[PDB]
Design a protein around this ligand. Sequence first.
Ligand SMILES: *[P@@](=O)(OCc1ccccc1O)Oc1ccccc1C
Ligand SMILES: *[C@@H]1O[C@H](CO)[C@@H](O)[C@H](O)[C@H]1NC(C)=O
Ligand SMILES: [Cl-]
Ligand SMILES: [Cl-]
Ligand SMILES: [Cl-]
Length: 540
Amino acid sequence: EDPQLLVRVRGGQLRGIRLKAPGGPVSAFLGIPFAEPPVGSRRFMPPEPKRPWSGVLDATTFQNVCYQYVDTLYPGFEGTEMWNPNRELSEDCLYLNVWTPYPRPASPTPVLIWIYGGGFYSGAASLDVYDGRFLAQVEGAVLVSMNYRVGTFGFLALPGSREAPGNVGLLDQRLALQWVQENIAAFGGDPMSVTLFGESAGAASVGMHILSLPSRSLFHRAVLQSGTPNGPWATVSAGEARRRATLLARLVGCPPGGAGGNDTELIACLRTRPAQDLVDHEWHVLPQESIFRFSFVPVVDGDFLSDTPEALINTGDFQDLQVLVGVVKDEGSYFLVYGVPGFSKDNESLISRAQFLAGVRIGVPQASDLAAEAVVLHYTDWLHPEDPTHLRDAMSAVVGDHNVVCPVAQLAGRLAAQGARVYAYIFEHRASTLTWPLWMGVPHGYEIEFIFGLPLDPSLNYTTEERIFAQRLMKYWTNFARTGDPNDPRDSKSPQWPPYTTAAQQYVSLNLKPLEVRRGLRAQTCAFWNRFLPKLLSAT
Ligand SMILES: *[P@@](=O)(OCc1ccccc1O)Oc1ccccc1C
Ligand SMILES: *[C@@H]1O[C@H](CO)[C@@H](O)[C@H](O)[C@H]1NC(C)=O
Ligand SMILES: [Cl-]
Ligand SMILES: [Cl-]
Ligand SMILES: [Cl-]
């Protein structure tokens, strides 16, 4: 028996596995159950704490990926498939993972918790890109990532009912946070210093846990990468959620005869449905022709979220809090191949002006005609309005700015304004190994493999530049995680990464070159998106 691989948590004993990271061994305890399986009658309902077990639980392998839609756009192509599920599908899927150094660390170690993204529809904590082994080996960290429920299973809501209350995926995440608070000490982690970091939907989730008190009590620092709790895609009014669930039920023959009024007898019917029925039907309820919008997301129930996120970020008090926010250089591009006609991974995707206008209607789905007109006006180069290259890059920009960049702006501005200590970044490095075409720049999601330090694995064919860069990012993130500052304490030569402030508005470029400080995060464009646009498409 290996003393370092046997742990006894509150539920009982579990056995881990000694892994080879490049630079040495690490400890991995994978597939630890944190909730009773939300299957059958527990469908759509909040997680229940995992009932204690006997004997030593085998924690040496990844557990099931939560039942979910699978991406089929470009089959065989690494660039999409990397995000696809890599273990079996199952509603029995609420397991988590811990990486630590080997031997398990002597002193309480600052814990990193990873919340994955993927539309609140796709997702798994077991994907190669979210592999904690490098951070554990190299920076000495204790890294935790959980599975949470995505899709209808995680987010179908009849707001106010008992049987489908909404935001149960977030509650899964929270339960995982509680497990960490209650048990991470056993692995050498330190419950007194917990950082959540996430991406896309993940970041939105992190945002939500900032904004919802009982989660807020369970950690100390956040990192939001390319996503926010505010913004157009991360939430839904209870009205819309109710609409969407009702409609989904209708689509899977679940009125059954024509009803939907008795919620209990509706959710009941739904629970009698095969999981792939629900998947194969989930996207159908989206109200408009759109990209960067999924059917089932966090809902504004006045419970988990006491008000809209935007309200909360406006009126909160965040003195107690340090956040690291940032975006990649080309947020929008990835999404264009998923709906905006004229865009493909297979060519330069040069577009006509017509395709551009139609594309704006698709990308800013909830725009009024006048809103769309303002968008087109702002984004056109009126000197060369016909130029396909400018147009293409513009469409990428519209989608990026609208969905990611300017919400990150807004959120950093408010949090800074509201007491928090914020640090901001722009990730500008195209991975040498990127399989997506050149026109897509540094797409949404492609900084993760660096933060997790995958280029430290020589078999993975990054450049030495990229190995070094990876180590730099890892140092940044763990420094933050450890001490609410990404800077190197034992140094002055970086140069320093300054806090984002409403006054100075400073962020840094993370690329191969040394830190460079820039002021104004898409300032003017974001004034357009965040100050005017709402005055416009409302009061229309
Ligand atoms: P995000 O969750 O983006 C996906 C998404 C978000 C909102 C609506 C629809 C949709 O598809 O996560 C990623 C995007 C692209 C690549 C990788 C991830 C994790
Ligand atoms: C909903 O309506 C049905 C009758 O169609 C009834 O049997 C059931 O008790 C009702 N549920 C609740 C919780 O009132
Ligand atoms: Cl019950
Ligand atoms: Cl025109
Ligand atoms: Cl470009």
